[PDB]
């Protein structure tokens, strides 16, 4: 049948620690069975940003054996304090949604 989402995984998955002006780039991978389509939806702390500018616009997929991976990336070029918080990536197939989270910290010092 081939409609299962196996998991949704963030990279880095934990311990992200940034300074003001530094880049945040988060990878989200949905591993699935062969027949699945995926739509990604991100939640982030800052109300500074449109989803459209943070989330990749290109198609990022991979097929191998009887599995597929779908990649979504969130990029903030130059973080501020309001970017500290929980980032959630949800992957939806229409049948089901699976999600994963990580906490990003922003320290108040200029980036090296």
């Amino acid at each position: 049948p081939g409609y299962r989402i196996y998991d949704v995984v963030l990279s880095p998955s934990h311990g992200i620690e940034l300074s003001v002006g530094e880049k945040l780039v988060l990878n989200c991978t949905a591993r699935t069975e062969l027949n699945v389509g995926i739509d990604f939806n991100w939640e982030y702390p800052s109300s500074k940003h449109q989803h459209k500018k943070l989330v990749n616009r290109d198609l990022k997929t991979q097929s191998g054996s009887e599995m597929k991976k779908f990649l979504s990336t969130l990029t903030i070029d130059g973080v501020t304090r309001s970017d500290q918080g929980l980032y959630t990536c949800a992957a939806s197939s229409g049948l089901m949604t699976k999600k994963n989270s990580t906490f990003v910290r922003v320290h108040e010092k200029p980036f090296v």
Partner: antibody
Amino acid sequence: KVQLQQSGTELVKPGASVKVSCKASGYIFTEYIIHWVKQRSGQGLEWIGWLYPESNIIKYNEKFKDKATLTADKSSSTVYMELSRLTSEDSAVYFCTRHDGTNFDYWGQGTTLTVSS
Amino acid sequence: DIVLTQSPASLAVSLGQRATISCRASESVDSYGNSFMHWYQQKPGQPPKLLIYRASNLESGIPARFSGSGSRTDFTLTINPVEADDVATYYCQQSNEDPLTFGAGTKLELKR
């Protein structure tokens, strides 16, 4: 609407200092980093530095470390750039611009500085 | 400390033809799987205006006549076809590393 409003044209003697202002409105001031950019006679862009108003973290281009001083007044939503020990090489349009975490999204109208005796 | 070499300094194009502007960086402007290269347009008396962010993303409101590509150290802005409203100066800018740096600019004029 977001606007950045810059102070008017300045005519300053060599050796003196000038303090140029950028007034922000239409948004939460403390949340966005403000950058300054120099342009001589309508061609070429040079980044000077940025200021983060929430905690006043500042980063400079090394080329401008001795020349520019960035400050902010949260109560009036204004970022200032001071330029010291002026010479004709400092005559330029100076822009302020807001960065949103992706790009410069709003710009001031520019402030013309003319250093002259 | 990244130097951007933009060419040509000046370009005379006929209405309806293609313009190609190049930017070479002294070192990679890529990190984390992104290219931190941006393209601006500037007309006289006005501030610069963003066309393309991160090498290939078209800013909202910019026509698809404008197209960016490349990676690492070599980047291209294509304009195809050239409308008369394209008469302006064009800048590349990198945000991979501080200090932020711009190319010298390409001035686009019309053939007659």
